[PDB]
């Protein structure tokens, strides 16, 4: 069961600058003290990325954006709102769908023919009587059809929390769909109370190389909502989406083998 809970507010997306964000490791070999030059899909430096945030002010929005040859994702996180994505092409009808998800202990990756409603969300229910919180809710897809791929692993979205003060959990992701391989890159960085993509550098680690071999053109991001008894609303979230383009970078490697800075 799904329901038309749109309450969508239209506002222009505030383009903001990332300041040298979106670079990852191009190859699976350990260099050091070198200036290796590479040509791959990268987010260009000082580029406009789309600040999307549907919370604060019962403002809820979760539109379908195209997967134009590369997606950079960021999710400055406070109370675990961004839970996964539903990459695809039509996100409905008779086509192939991908439902990358991060639940409380694992990562479920499903390439399947799901049928989708207009407003997908992951609903967590809390009981007075049992107090257990369970994800046993499914409203992004009504049912499944001819299902093809399943994958269970350690979740991508990782807490990495326990430290105090003003640092924040900035989680960065890179999605790309070259010839039949779905590659996911990530890194998580503490940030000292910044209300913008931080001015530093990032080293996005490889996570999965999924053998999917699908079209995909309409990537979308899942959120999680509590139950309450304005039905099914809750949280606080803000995330940032930018697109990768075929570019050429020059990376300088430090003595630990990790990159220091990248010159576009």
């Amino acid at each position, epitope marked *: 069961q799904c329901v038309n809970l749109t309450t969508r507010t239209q506002l222009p997306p505030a383009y903001t600058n990332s300041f040298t964000r979106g670079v990852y490791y191009p190859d699976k070999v350990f260099r050091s003290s070198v200036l290796h030059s590479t040509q791959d899909l990268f987010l260009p430096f000082f580029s406009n990325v789309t600040w999307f945030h549907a919370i604060h002010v019962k403002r809820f929005d979760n539109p379908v954006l195209p997967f134009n040859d590369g997606v950079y994702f960021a999710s400055t996180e406070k109370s675990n709102i961004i839970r996964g994505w539903i990459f695809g092409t039509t996100l409905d009808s008779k086509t192939q769908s991908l439902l990358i998800v991060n639940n409380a*202990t694992n990562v479920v990756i499903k390439v399947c023919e799901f049928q989708f409603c207009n407003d997908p969300f992951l609903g967590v229910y809390y009981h007075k009587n049992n107090k257990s919180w369970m994800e046993s809710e499914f409203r992004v897809y009504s049912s499944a059809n001819n299902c093809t791929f399943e994958y269970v692993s350690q979740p991508f979205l990782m*807490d990495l929390e*326990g430290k*105090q003060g003003n640092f924040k959990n900035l989680r960065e992701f890179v999605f790309k769909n070259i010839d039949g391989y779905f590659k996911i890159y990530s890194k998580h960085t503490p940030i000292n109370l910044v209300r913008d993509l931080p001015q530093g550098f990032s080293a996005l680690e490889p996570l999965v190389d999924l053998p999917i071999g699908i079209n995909i053109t309409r990537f979308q991001t899942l959120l999680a909502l509590h139950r309450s008894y304005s039905g099914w609303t809750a949280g606080a979230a803000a995330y940032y989406v930018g697109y990768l383009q075929p570019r050429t970078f020059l990376l300088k490697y430090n003595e630990n083998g990790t990159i220091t800075d990248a010159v576009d």
Partner: antibody
Amino acid sequence: EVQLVESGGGLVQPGGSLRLACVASGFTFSIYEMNWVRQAPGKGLEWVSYITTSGHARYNADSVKGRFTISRDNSKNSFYLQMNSLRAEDTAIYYCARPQYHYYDTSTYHSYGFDIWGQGTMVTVS
Amino acid sequence: QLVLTQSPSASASLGASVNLTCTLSSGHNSYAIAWHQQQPEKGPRYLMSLNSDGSHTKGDGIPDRFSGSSSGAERFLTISSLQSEDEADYYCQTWDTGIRVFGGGTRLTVLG
């Protein structure tokens, strides 16, 4: 009801291996990560190790001399301190406690401090 | 990490008021704490997780008597109108990057 019951005592020379457990019921294990705290007889309580909800482990606190290991069995709804190499100082109460930060949380993160505590077990070791 | 300069022995009359003090290392000035009271021959009891502004999150069975305040890099727990049950060990603890320190005890020999 939240409760943290333990078992697995035994008397061994330092370097011996035992089987320690902290069984619980009445609440979700999937969204609660667990810590361990050590309290020598007449001494102050001291944490030793913990496991996260995902499955990552932290053998920190530098009182564990590479002797204690932590795991969790989400399938059987139980929590074990994967135990080997007991040593002389390990004769103590082993209160297993439950951090306040469940994975589906709101408000400020004034959590990861224990809201409830186990009854503790005495594992005499010499 | 933070060290507790909590007096090994502090005391006052029953029904009076005292303030225990939890001192914290200068490196983590804005860090929050939570207080656990260890009555003898029993288990730990969590009272409050004290914010830097003195706000309350309360455990069961704890009156409005037990309150916390903050000033600078140190912290307070307030007790007013002391009674018999106050004779216990008080522990001040913290959070870190996978470290919980827990400090030491506050053995309080309140005469009354």
